[PDB]
């Protein structure tokens, strides 16, 4: 778990860019890597930044395990122009806006072993059928326009993203780096390792069911209601 | 070794050598070379040049490369050549790079950074730049911002002006990293500051900028401006200026008003006789110009601005009324001008009836402008002043005279000759562009430094880097930003320094014998040796954990705090070893006093008389220490906070130094001690921070932080003791009834409700026997005014344990302008421990605001913890 | 006190009180065995020593319950600090006893105070104080409430616990003279009682509602009949800025001193 | 030890008069006055006044504090 003391989210998110690359070069240099991000658009940007700081190392296109001639059949199917580039160097990304064919392609390229790194929107943590060796979660908050504030990733989500580093067929280990805010550091240190408690919410969301159940005559009177409870 | 100019001669008198050089001869206009009017240069840029019909010769020389190329620039031209308007064009190009047909200069594409060496200069520059560029409607402002309140403010700001230092801290924190990649242009103005002790900063800026561009592949224009000095090609190499198309050099002959230089060095060893000799040289030199002409005296003292005057006066009276009649007659030349302006704030009332007056920031605010008006219109031919007059609003003088060249440096603990840029600026004020034929200037100095001041004002002087002194601090901050992981990246970084090209092209000077230079041509092994010692220094003071084997650095929070506050690595380790949870205020001050930044401050015999009085008039006992530097610094800080005036000048300057550095120092203390979690001391330290910022103790009424308030009213409410939070219960009438000043009743009320107030609720539920969940609901209770609270208001929320001893958790909560009155919901978890305690406390406190706090006991008296969970 | 120099000597002294905190002694002497035995949680003791001063006595009021099924031991779970001021030999605290909600669950066990010089007896000022509380308060039981005297030994702290005997209670109710040797005072008046320190549970503090507790620096603002409320929060140290307003309110200055050194150099923010 | 006990305070008087002059000028001045007064055996005071005059105007009531002082070294 990597604590960052910058509260202002843009600055924080930006200043964890370099650590992402380093987290790869450290924990999983040659093995598949998935990076989860707070924003639909952030996926592009982070794929780019991974490539631009990839140049720094004096090491270019280290995440591409096949020649450019092989990727051409796959790239013919693309609309997004930047995705072509990011894929050309071995990265690529997945998000809401991508055509299902584009997504299927990227997934194929990753699992087959052609591209070593994929940056993915957070929303795709649940429905993603392609696993990895190292998983790097970048900045566990997201933005909500309704109250105009950032709000933390639901814990089960985080656990799911973490579980996305599993490769039982081959690897003897699997790795995860979670870069988060100062505040949110201790919480993860406590609750990712221990088994989780789970509590009921029915007390709050209650009316709809009593109504529906009364309709079926499963609750005919107040007593039946307590019994149902 | 130095050089004559052409017609120059040495004539030595008793006790002083006097050197004379004549004015330079302007280079004859080249074949078919004309000035450029404001017509024949591109359509858009022409706007905002109004009032000015023609371009200056040099401006006209390089305008082409200015607006037609992204190639980097270096110009070396003498003071007075008007360098700004060159750089201005380099800006008007970028301002033009983003333009539309149906809208002009759409401003979210680009931002420009103008780095100027002096504060007054920055102020006045934003002042005039605003007016000028306003035709475009582009918003230009000074960056004085504290980081967090004004970021989102300067978000919408373009072409931001700042001192190199400001840019460096603000980049170390990352306030810049939200701005950058929107930056296509940075201006380094007066880049010859490379030679100053401040030099390493400019070196750190530019090095970072270049080293960064190599990673991003996105480039930036860099425009350097310098006084005319050798080592121009070295500064060129540093700025990555292609010497072919990018380099520009002009010698001292291009000063718009030719300068006849007079330098009198004094041979007298005894200072007691010297303080006569220089007086007399002043008198003779001033009587030389006592006819129709204008003199300006730059003294480096505050008070001596008027001590130098009245000496000239009493001398002219002792002259049997000779030297007087500074006019063409009795009534002629407007002596009624000098007489009818009579009543003024300063001591001017004595000097004004006669021919001369004084100017400086201290005595008045508006009457400085009222004196500047008087000098421009030539009603006063003798004006004695300070360097801030040369650095501030621009007015020249027919002939200027620099008295003594030596100043008092509280940073150095002693006296030292003033900086390069100070003379260059104040002597570059010599002669008018309009009303003058040629300017002269007279530097009265010590003979020993007489060689030096010649190597400057004629281009003999090398520009060298002071980088080595600061190398350990520079390296840290780069590790802190993550721009250097290991030794290799460190040598790569240092390879971008000015000190690198200087170590390359003059190894003899920088400590490299030529043979071992041949043995290592690239300086790989010297740059590896260099930085290795910095690495060791940072390791020994615990800024970095770096093992020799890997060559890798690891940052520590202490290191980050150090970088972020621009505090040296000796001071920070002093704090590491000294700071303990149990420190009283009594001791906190001492630890502050032990800051390595103050190492040279000492206590003088003469002032130990006043320090004792001050020592007994301070609220926080120093008495742990006797008279030694610790005591002086301590009693000084207290004096500043307690707002006490000091008789000695030495102490005043000293105090100023101490208090200015104190903000960063105390703050780094707070940050450290907070990261540790030690509740009591983080309170004592943030409160100290506020007390320094606001210049008052907490025991004084919070209403004082609103400067809008009358002093007598404040003192009146302090007279009767009526606890401040009890003002909210009272209406507009009930307020005035306390102090029996009912006419004030409304206005007071406004402020009481302007004072930031949060009310807070909490919903607490246990999660496991170890941890509880807390939902804190912050509801703003105060009336927002952006002319008081501004764009943002900052608060620390921290939950403290049973004894208010340990801080179990803390967040930085920031309520923006828009959202006052909107309740914010913060959710966080806290641990509980085996002797389940009676309660926690949830504290919320404004960062900057003093006496502004709300505490919320969270009681566990009824808490029922969950059943422990089976294996 | 000298009110100037006297303040500061003791002030830089008290900044080391926390050193005492880890060397403490407790009187072990003959146990009546029919008596109650009081357990003092160590944390409150530490903090109480830390706020004090080495000359002026400060005092605090004890509140606790007996553990379930164990009526003969009294756990002290709370200390309350009220507006007060001391002498070197005694402490003046107001007539009103603590009233507050967190307190309703527990019983009063008496009080505890700092004692600049160690004496192996309960000071007449104390037995008199205690009896006079007890007279006015039925809430305080003669047999259940004690006086814990915490004395500052060299580099240390050392404490004893007393109970009034009925002889003592009557003498004290009666006694006017507050001098160090009143008429009719006897060692028969008090009795030592058994007390233990403990790390097993944590005690907590109650503290004045609209002010702090320490009135030593304002004696004229303190009155026997003064009323106060309470809150859950810890005591501030003796010399804490708040207890000392008169001293931070020493500023006589004209603003224009700032005119001098009007060179403003800042350059940072 | 006693000579310097009062030599410092001589320097105080200097600053009080002159103000915060550069070190060299403060201590140099000290050497001057101390040198002038010290030859009491020279005595005079008419001459001493002339010697003092060589310093011109110092007001007065200070110059006495430098009298009784300069007797005490």
Walk me through this protein's architecture.
This is part of a larger assembly, with three copies of chain A and one copy of chain C (269 residues). Chain A has 229 residues and is of the alpha/beta class. Chain A has helices at residues 9-15, 17-27, 42-56, 68-75, 81-88, 100-112, 155-163, 185-191, 207-215, 222-228; strands at 2-4, 33-37, 93-94, 117-121, 134-138, 141-144, 149-152, 175-181. Chain A contains ten helices and eight strands. Chain A starts with a strand and ends with a helix. Chain C has 269 residues and is an alpha/beta fold. Chain C contains six helices and 13 strands. Chain C has helices at 5-14, 17-20, 42-51, 124-136, 166-174, 245-248; strands spanning 24-26, 37-41, 59-65, 73-80, 85-86, 91-92, 107-115, 146-153, 156-164, 190-192, 194-198, 204-208, 230-232. In chain C, strands 1, 2, 3, 4, 7, 8, 9, 10, 11, 12 and 13 form an eleven-stranded mixed sheet that branches. Chain C is globular, with a radius of gyration of 21 Å. At the B-C interface, α4, α26, α29 and β25 of B face α1 and α6 of C. Chain D: Belongs to the helicase family. SKI2 subfamily. Chain D: This is U5 small nuclear ribonucleoprotein 200 kDa helicase. Chain D: It is found in: Nucleus. Chain C: Residues 37-168 form the MPN domain.
């Amino acid at each position: 778990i990597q604590g960052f003391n910058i509260s202002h989210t843009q600055t924080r998110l930006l200043s964890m860019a370099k650590p992402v690359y380093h987290a790869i070069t450290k924990h999983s240099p040659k093995k598949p890597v998935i990076v989860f991000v707070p924003s639909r658009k952030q996926t592009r940007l982070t794929a780019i930044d991974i490539l631009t700081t990839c140049a720094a190392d004096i090491q270019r296109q280290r995440f591409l395990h096949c020649t450019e001639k092989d990727l051409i059949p796959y790239l013919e199917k693309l609309s997004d122009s930047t995705l072509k580039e990011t894929l050309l160097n071995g990265v690529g990304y997945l998000h809401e806006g991508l055509s299902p064919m584009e997504r299927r392609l990227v997934e194929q390229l990753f699992s087959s072993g052609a591209i070593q790194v994929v940056v993915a929107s957070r929303s795709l943590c649940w429905g993603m059928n392609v696993a990895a060796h190292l998983v790097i979660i970048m900045d566990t908050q997201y933005y909500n326009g309704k109250i105009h504030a950032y709000v933390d990733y639901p814990i089960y989500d985080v656990l799911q993203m973490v579980g996305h580093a599993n490769r039982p067929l081959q690897d003897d280990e699997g790795r995860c780096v979670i870069m988060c805010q100062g505040s949110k550091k201790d919480f993860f240190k406590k609750f990712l390792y221990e088994p989780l408690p789970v509590e009921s919410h029915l007390d709050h969301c209650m009316h709809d069911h009593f109504n529906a159940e009364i309709v079926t005559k499963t609750i005919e009177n107040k007593q039946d209601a307590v019994d149902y409870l | 070794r130095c050089q004559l100019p052409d017609g120059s001669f040495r004539r030595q008198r008793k006790g002083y050598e006097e050197v004379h050089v004549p004015a330079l001869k302007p280079k004859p206009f080249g074949s078919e070379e004309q000035l450029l009017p404001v017509e024949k240069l591109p359509k858009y840029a022409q706007a905002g040049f109004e009032g000015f019909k023609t371009l200056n010769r040099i401006q006209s020389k390089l305008y082409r490369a200015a607006l037609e190329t992204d190639e980097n620039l270096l110009l070396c031209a003498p003071t007075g050549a008007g360098k700004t308007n060159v750089a201005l064009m380099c800006m008007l190009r970028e301002i033009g790079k983003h333009i539309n047909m149906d809208g002009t200069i759409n401003v979210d594409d680009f931002k420009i950074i103008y780095i100027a060496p002096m504060r007054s200069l920055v102020q006045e520059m934003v002042g005039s730049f605003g007016k000028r560029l306003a035709t475009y409607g582009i918003t230009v402002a000074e960056l004085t911002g504290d980081h967090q309140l004004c970021k989102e403010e300067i978000s919408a700001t373009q072409i931001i002006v700042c001192t190199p230092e400001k840019w460096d801290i603000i980049t170390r924190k990352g306030g810049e990293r939200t701005y950058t990649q929107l930056v296509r242009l940075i201006i380094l103005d007066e880049i010859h500051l490379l030679h100053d002790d401040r030099g390493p900063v400019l070196e750190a800026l530019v090095a970072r900028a270049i080293r960064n561009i190599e990673m991003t592949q996105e480039d930036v224009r860099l425009i350097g401006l310098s006084a005319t000095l050798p080592n121009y090609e070295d500064v060129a190499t540093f700025l990555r200026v292609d010497p072919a198309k990018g380099l520009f050099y002009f010698d001292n002959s291009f000063r718009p008003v030719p300068l006849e230089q007079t330098y009198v060095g004094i041979t007298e060893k005894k200072a007691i006789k010297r303080f006569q000799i220089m007086n007399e040289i002043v008198y003779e030199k001033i009587m030389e110009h006592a006819g129709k002409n204008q003199v300006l005296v730059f003294v480096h003292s505050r008070k001596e601005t008027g001590k130098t005057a009245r000496a000239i006066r009493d001398m002219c009276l002792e002259k049997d009324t000779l030297g007087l009649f500074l006019r063409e007659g009795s009534a002629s030349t407007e002596v009624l001008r000098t007489e009818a302006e009579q009543c003024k704030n300063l001591e001017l009332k004595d000097l004004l009836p006669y021919g001369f007056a004084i100017h400086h920031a201290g005595m008045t605010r508006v009457d400085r402008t009222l004196v500047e008006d008087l000098f421009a219109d030539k009603h006063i031919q003798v004006l004695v002043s300070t360097a801030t007059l040369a650095w501030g609003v621009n007015l020249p003088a027919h002939t200027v005279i620099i008295k003594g060249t030596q100043v008092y440096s509280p940073e150095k603990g002693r006296w030292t000759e003033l900086g390069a840029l100070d003379i260059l600026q104040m002597l570059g004020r010599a002669g008018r562009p309009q009303y003058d034929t040629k300017g002269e200037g007279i530097l009265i100095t010590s003979h020993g430094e007489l060689q030096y001041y010649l190597s400057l004002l004629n281009q003999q002087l090398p520009i060298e880097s002071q980088m080595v002194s600061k190398l350990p601090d520079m390296l840290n901050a780069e590790i802190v930003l993550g721009n250097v992981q290991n030794a290799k990246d460190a040598v790569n970084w240092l390879g971008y320094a000015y000190l690198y090209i200087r170590m390359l092209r003059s190894p003899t000077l920088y400590g490299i014998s030529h043979d071992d230079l041949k043995g290592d041509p690239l300086l790989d092994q010297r740059r590896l040796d260099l930085v290795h010692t910095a690495a060791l220094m940072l390791d020994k003071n615990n800024l970095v954990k770096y093992d020799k084997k890997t060559g890798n650095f690891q940052v520590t929070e202490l290191g980050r705090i150090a970088s972020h506050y621009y505090i040296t690595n000796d001071t920070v380790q002093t704090y590491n070893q000294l700071l303990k949870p149990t420190l009283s205020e009594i001791e906190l001050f001492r630890v502050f006093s032990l800051s390595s930044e103050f190492k040279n401050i000492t206590v003088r015999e003469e002032e130990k008389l006043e320090l004792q009085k001050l020592l007994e008039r301070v609220p926080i006992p120093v008495k742990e220490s006797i008279e030694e530097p610790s005591a002086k610094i301590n009693v000084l800080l207290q004096a500043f906070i307690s707002q006490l005036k000091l008789e000695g000048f030495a102490l005043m300057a000293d105090m100023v130094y101490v208090t200015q550095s104190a903000g960063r120092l105390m703050r780094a203390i707070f940050e450290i001690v907070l990261n540790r979690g030690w509740a009591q001391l983080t309170d004592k330290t943030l409160n100290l921070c506020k007390m320094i910022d606001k210049r008052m103790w907490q025991s004084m009424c919070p209403l004082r932080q609103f400067r809008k308030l009358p002093e007598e009213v404040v003192k009146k409410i302090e007279k009767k003791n009526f606890p401040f939070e009890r003002l909210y219960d009272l209406n507009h009438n009930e307020i005035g009834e306390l102090i029996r000043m009912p006419k004030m009743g409304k206005t007071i009320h406004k402020y009481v409700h302007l004072f930031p107030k949060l009310e807070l609720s909490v919903h607490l539920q246990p999660i496991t026997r170890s941890t509880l969940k807390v939902e804190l609901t912050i509801t703003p209770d105060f009336q927002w005014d952006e002319k008081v609270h501004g764009s943002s208001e900052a608060f620390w929320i921290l939950v403290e344990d049973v004894d208010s001893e340990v801080i179990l958790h803390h967040e930085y909560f920031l309520l923006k302008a828009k959202y006052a009155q909107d309740e914010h919901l913060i959710t966080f978890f806290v641990p509980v421990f085996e002797p389940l305690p009676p309660q926690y406390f949830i504290r919320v406190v404004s960062d900057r605001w003093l006496s502004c706090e709300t505490q919320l006991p969270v009681s566990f008296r009824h808490l029922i913890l969950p059943e422990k969970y089976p294996p | 006190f000298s009110s100037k120099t006297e303040w500061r000597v003791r002030a830089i002294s008290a900044a080391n009180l926390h050193l005492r905190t880890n060397h403490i002694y407790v009187s072990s002497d003959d146990i009546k065995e029919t008596g109650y035995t009081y357990i003092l949680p160590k944390n409150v003791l530490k903090k109480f020593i830390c706020i004090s001063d080495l000359r002026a006595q400060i005092a605090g009021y004890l509140y606790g319950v007996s553990p379930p099924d164990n009526p003969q031991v009294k756990e002290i779970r709370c200390i309350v600090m009220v507006p007060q001021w001391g002498t070197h030999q005694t402490v003046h605290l107001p007539g009103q006893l603590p009233q507050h909600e967190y307190l309703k669950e527990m019983e009063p066990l008496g009080w505890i105070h700092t004692q600049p010089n160690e004496s192996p007896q309960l000071s007449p000022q104390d037995v008199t104080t205690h009896a006079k509380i007890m007279a006015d308060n039925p809430s305080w039981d003669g047999e259940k409430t004690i006086i814990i005297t915490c004395s500052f030994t060299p580099g240390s702290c050392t404490l004893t616990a007393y109970k009034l005997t009925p002889s003592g209670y009557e003498w004290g109710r009666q006694n006017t003279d507050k001098g160090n040797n009143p008429k009719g005072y006897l060692p028969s008046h008090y009795e030592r009682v058994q007390m233990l320190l403990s790390d097993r549970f944590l005690g907590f503090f109650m503290v004045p509602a609209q002010s702090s507790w320490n009135y030593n620096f304002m004696g004229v603002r303190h009155d026997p009949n003064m009323k106060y409320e309470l809150q859950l929060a810890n005591p501030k140290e003796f010399y804490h800025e708040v207890h000392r307003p008169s001293h931070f309110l020493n500023f006589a200055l004209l603003q224009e001193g700032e005119v001098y050194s009007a060179d403003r150099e800042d350059l940072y923010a | 030890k006693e000579t310097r006990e009062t030599y410092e305070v001589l320097l105080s008087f200097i600053q009080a008069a002159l103000g915060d002059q550069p070190r060299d000028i403060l201590c140099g001045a000290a050497d001057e006055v101390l040198a002038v007064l010290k030859n009491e055996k020279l005595r005079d005071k008419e001459r001493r006044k002339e010697i003092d005059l060589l310093l011109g105007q110092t007001d007065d009531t200070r110059y006495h504090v430098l009298v009784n002082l300069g007797k005490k070294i």
